[PDB]
Amino acid sequence: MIQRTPKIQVYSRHPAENGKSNFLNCYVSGFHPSDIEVNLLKNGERIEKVEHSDLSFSKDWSFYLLYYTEFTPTEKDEYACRVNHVTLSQPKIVKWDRDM
């Protein structure tokens, strides 16, 4: 049996401009087993948009998930990715930083 902790990156498709339609991406990589929960949060609430996701696999017991939704950045809204996985003792929340 093998288990690997997901690496989590949160980033927009295009440079963020308040307040212009864009896409917010989570790339959750290198994890095992495949059981996982991934959501984008807006001010702590699951994003009120259609989710897109794409799962792939490496032969070295590794899964890769690209997850995204539409979003319109603003100054006051904070976004985050929330991941839960058996390797995590609590859900992991990774903030979006448009300057990161």
Author numbering: 0 to 99
From the publication, what sentences describe this entry?
In the wt β2m structure, residue D38 resides in an area rich in positively charged residues, and establishes H-bonds with both R45 and R81. Upon D38N mutation, the interaction with R81 is lost, while H-bonding is maintained with R45. To compensate for the lack of the D38 negative charge, the E50 side chain moves toward the mutation site, bringing the E50 carboxylate at H-bonding distance with N38 and, in parallel, pulling along all the CC’D-loop. Contrary to the D53N, D59N and D98N mutants, the structure of the D38N mutant displays evident conformational changes relative to wt β2m and the other D-to-N variants. RMSD values calculated between D38N and both wt β2m and D76N are over 3 Å, when 97 Cα atoms are taken in account. The values drop to about 1.2 Å when the β2m AB-loop, which is found in the closed conformation in D38N, is excluded from the calculation. The β2m region surrounding the D38N mutation site undergoes significant conformational changes, leading to rearrangements in both the CC’D-loop and the C-terminal tail. Moreover, in D38N variant both D and E strands are longer due to torsion of Psi angle of S57 and the formation of a H-bond between the O atom of this residue and the N of S61. The analysis of D38N Bz-score distribution shows a pattern similar to the D76N variant: the EF-loop (hosting N76 in the pathologic mutant), is more rigid than in all other variants, while the CC’D-loop (as in D76N) and the C-terminal tail show higher flexibility. Although this mutant is the most destabilised (ΔTm of—3.4°C), the Tm drop is much lower than in the case of the D76N variant (ΔTm of—10.4°C) and, importantly, D38N does not display increased aggregation propensity.
